[PDB]
Amino acid sequence: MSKLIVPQWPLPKGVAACSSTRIGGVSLPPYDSLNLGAHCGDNPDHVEENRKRLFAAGNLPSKPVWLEQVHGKDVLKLTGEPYASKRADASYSNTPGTVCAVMTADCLPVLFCNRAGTEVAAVHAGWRGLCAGVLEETVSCFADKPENILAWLGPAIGPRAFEVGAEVREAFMAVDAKASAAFIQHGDKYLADIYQLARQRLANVGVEQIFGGDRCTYTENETFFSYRRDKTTGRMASFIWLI
């Protein structure tokens, strides 16, 4: 009964993508059902069961190439299983069968693929990496032209729960003063719209086509895990790959 989100976009013929929810797994509170993360304290066998179940649900051709997400802006081109460091917050693939995966629980998941369906990419974009331009570095790994790139914004904490400090807002404006529209005042802090921020950097890059960005990990607690909300909790993941 694993419920799986399918990105609403003109998915190209040779591309398959899926994003998970906290439902249909086997873990117990505070990671109650489909927790894919192996680093939040959950029962290690349950995490294996959840992964085994989601891979089947998603018809993944092979195991996802999990990164060592350090909230930076480095993109790891999945050229071949023999890697040095998997340390990074994005992956790019031009290889059929290889699975791009990003692990999240509030941070912005973003999936990319060219219209021809010959190259994909997955990104975990927290504010720091977002601000440092992880989306720009990902896009630049694409041989194709921005014009031909599709971007899907996965479930993340929305503009009603993503409360951030004044530095975060000033951090963004100090790169593209137009980020001012993504912040609304809420006391000595602001309510940021990570989707709006992504769209801006994406536009700056040329990517005219963007979908998703209509969910909230924090608010829809019955569907997603949320680090901001629960502190100790499970993890969801977004996957893309060339068939």
Place this chain on the structure above:
Amino acid sequence: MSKLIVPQWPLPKGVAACSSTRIGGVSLPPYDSLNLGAHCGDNPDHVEENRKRLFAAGNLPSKPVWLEQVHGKDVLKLTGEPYASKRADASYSNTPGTVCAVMTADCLPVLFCNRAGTEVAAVHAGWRGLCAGVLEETVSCFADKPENILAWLGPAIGPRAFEVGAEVREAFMAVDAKASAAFIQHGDKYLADIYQLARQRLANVGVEQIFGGDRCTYTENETFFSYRRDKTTGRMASFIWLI
């Protein structure tokens, strides 16, 4: 104008309580008339006005101490504004003037107080915190004995609309098989009686005096906001305090 629900129970001397409804406000759809929630996308000034009307109608001594409800089971004791964190789903107070409040739109609201009139508490009981035991934790905050504690169940999504998966039912039965009675199958799901579950947990702790729990936020769409019913909508709240 600001129709205010008054708990039907043996209200003690120095205690006052009220619970709001969607009527008598200033908001427009999908939050038409008295929305109290400031984080559901409503017009803040309207929310600002809806709150001022209620506080007057309710004749509250001060502004309510809004919590950061995360659907957990943490209870916050209101002894001094400088608080480490506001993250909680229940509040307790033995200080006059202090207003305990919980914001809802389906989840179970519960107000507490002792027969003496020296202790009060409010609880936002989502199904997880209810299961994880937020009512027991709230009670164990009272210096008085359960025998003397009065409990009121405010409007929540009733037993004819609160549909849940096998997980919910199982989670509850895990804690106490007796919880099987609050569930009645509907297709591949069940119909839960949140009030029934509250009463059981309340009884396990010796709370002999329980009132209310005859409403349904979902069904009575002309009186309450419903999260299950409307996806985007306002919020009601329940208030209690020592005069």
